[PDB]
């Protein structure tokens with residue numbers, strides 16, 4: 084085994100160099116390190132020219148010595164795909180990290196593959212109703228398209244993607260794959276428990292009846308792993324699309340972490356940096372990923388990729404490159420999230436190619452364009468409202484201000500998953516009902532209603548019901564407040580009777596710290 | 604390489620003279 | 636096409652020339668001839684000034700340097716390996732890389748000659764039962780079947796004992812560090828006890 | 829009990845090529861690990877951060893004004 088067993092030459096962080104005596108591996112192939120604590124998989128990214136490859140390590144390189152033998156697998160990183168992966172959590176190399184035994188593997192597919200060609204593309208435009216009002220009104224999602232949820236650092240793009248999972252992913256019929264690219268590990272555990280409690284993930288021997296495969300390379304992982312977990316989720320979704328031939332969902336969380344992991348790696352490969360600090364190969368790496376998430380003739384991948392923006396900057400090149408690859412774009416803003424509006428969809432920046440008068444109907448299209456027109460004419464007057472005040476505007480302008488303030492509150496909606504922390508129950512709105520509601524507010528059937536009746540309600544019935552509730556309670560008054568609190572017959576005990584009911588805990592002698600440190 | 608393995612060439616270590624003897628008479632007309 | 640593998644891997648761009656030189660001279664089994672020739676060229680650079688002027692001056696044309704290194708190395712029984720090496724290293728002005736290609740070649744040959752060096756530094760001149768008892772304790776630090784040589788140095792700072800200098804690891808079995816680690820071990824207890 | 833259990837251990841050492849800008853280009857240390865806590869002769873610790881092919885980059889956990897070449 085002298086040939087085809089290379090040794091580690093040098094290590095710069097997550098970048099490992101292997102030097103071979105003969106038969107260097109092809110680029111994008113997987114290497115294995117002999118005698119490391121965890122199974123450390125390298126992945127060749129370059130050829131350095133002195134019989135030396137330059138590998139990206141899929142785990143930590145802490146504890147690598149520059150004499151360690153590295154074997155070649157002669158193949159890329161290959162993950163276990165098939166129907167048996169339904170209900171498993173996988174890392175970037177295809178191991179189960181949910182502790183339920185090995186993965187029942189139909190086939191072993193590599194994660195590096197060419198995108199489907201031009202003639203294999205499908206040109207179909209059918210709507211995907213999600214129940215949110217801003218999505219189903221102003222930027223309707225293509226069923227089999229690509230969806231980007233921009234906005235960053237606490238605007239609610241991870242809540243919105245759980246709402247999209249909860250709405251679409253159970254009424255879909257096909258499978259689902261959640262690829263967590265560099266989001267929180269706690270969020271992955273929360274989604275795992277919430278998918279076990281909902282029934283889209285089952286355990287035991289009935290694992291195959293589940294409809295969701297989890298692939299997690301979450302934000303604790305080194306930048307070698309976060310750069311490849313999106314490709315593993317793509318391989319798992321592409322087995323269902325290419326071989327099973329049926330339509331899936333692919334919710335990729337924080338696809339900015341893919342570009343950021345490749346930028347953390349490409350700082351140490353010695354490449355010259357591009358604009359603000361990213362790699363030069365941003366657009367090609369993001370194309371070689373994002374063009375694999377496409378609906379072909381045989382199947383469909385309906386992807387909702389959350390895109391984190393850095394420091395709320397849309398002219399940053401890492402989301403501005405991503406803007407070209409998306410069909411329907413849902414930009415979230417913090418200036419609207421600081422107004423209490425939820426979900427904080429920016430209505431004058433979030434677009435879609437489905438918003439066309441030939442597809443979704445001229446009624447829905449004209450309602451959406453009128454809503455955008457009213458909000459834009461409101462946005463032009465914002466400095467005039469700021470410095471000069473509401474008391475000098477025109478009549479038509481201070482009517483469009485009131486209509487825009489009503490539709491801004493009306494675009495907000497309580498979510499089915501957000502009620503864990505807000506109390507308000509979530510409302511799944513149908514499509515024609517919110518179209519008719521916004522048609523009514525655009526025509527002016529609800530001018531005399533209060534503005535806070537539009538806040539956090541589902542459809543056009545519940546805004547009038549909340550107006551009736553909130554304009555009762557300004558005139559609701561009770562005489563003497565009907566307490567009847569004192570002198571309750573055999574109800575309240577004495578204070579010491581309730582004190583004696585309390586069982587008393589003992590105190591186990593000052594932290595006991597030496598007894599359970601000399602035990603190990 | 605280091606300096607420790609490079610200072611030790613300042614002492615002569617050939618243990619043969621079949622090159623430095625002959626070409627020392629040839630080098631001066633070669634540069635002439 | 637079929638080159639024998641070097642015994643230890645090395646660095647780049649000056650150690651690679653030594654790796655190729657050891658590979659080629661091991662295909663020809665002249666592995667100690669070319670080491671003698673490189674030693675002769677090191678001392679030949681030491682002797683005269685018109686030869687180190689071919690490696691430090693940046694205004695010598697490459698034509699006269701190539702023709703000087705060919706017409707000098709035409710004769711005197713020089714190896715084909717060293718002749719073509721010096722032709723290729725004088726064509727590109729890499730004659731100043733001789734001093735650090737021969738060191739990596741010596742490290743390669745020392746790996747092959749299966750001989751590792753050491754240096755024992757002492758306070759007194761060693762006697763013959765001190766020496767043959769020293770070799771048994773110092774051989775336990777080498778890691779295979781080698782030919783560990785034992786060099787001798789004398790330094791009065793040690794109060795007896797020995798310190799092995801392997802050029803990559805150091806075994807301080809001296810008494811001057813034994814009493815130095817003794818006085819450090821007491822004062823960590825007097826401050827505590 | 830300290831003399832009857834006293835074996836002076838073999839220690840793989842390495843020279844310092846250059847020190848400055850919070851790094852110590854350390855020659856040698858072929859058996860060092862990426863992220864191994866190294867310890868200079870002046871007592872100040874360090875971490876073998878960049879394991880290069882020709883040296884080992886060591887950041888200095890402390891003031892590097894006590895570290896020389898050699």
Ligand SMILES: Nc1ncnc2c1ncn2[C@@H]1O[C@H](COP(=O)(O)OP(=O)(O)O)[C@@H](O)[C@H]1O
Pocket residue numbers: 234235236237238239240241242243425426496497498501504505
């Ligand atoms: N629909 C919503 N209603 C109320 N609060 C929300 C909603 N969506 C998001 N939030 C707030 O946003 C916070 C988390 O945002 P998150 O989805 O984690 O965005 P990011 O992942 O970019 O931080 C939550 O604490 C929640 O209070």
Ligand SMILES: [Mg+2]
Pocket residue numbers: 240241242266267270
């Ligand atoms: Mg989140």
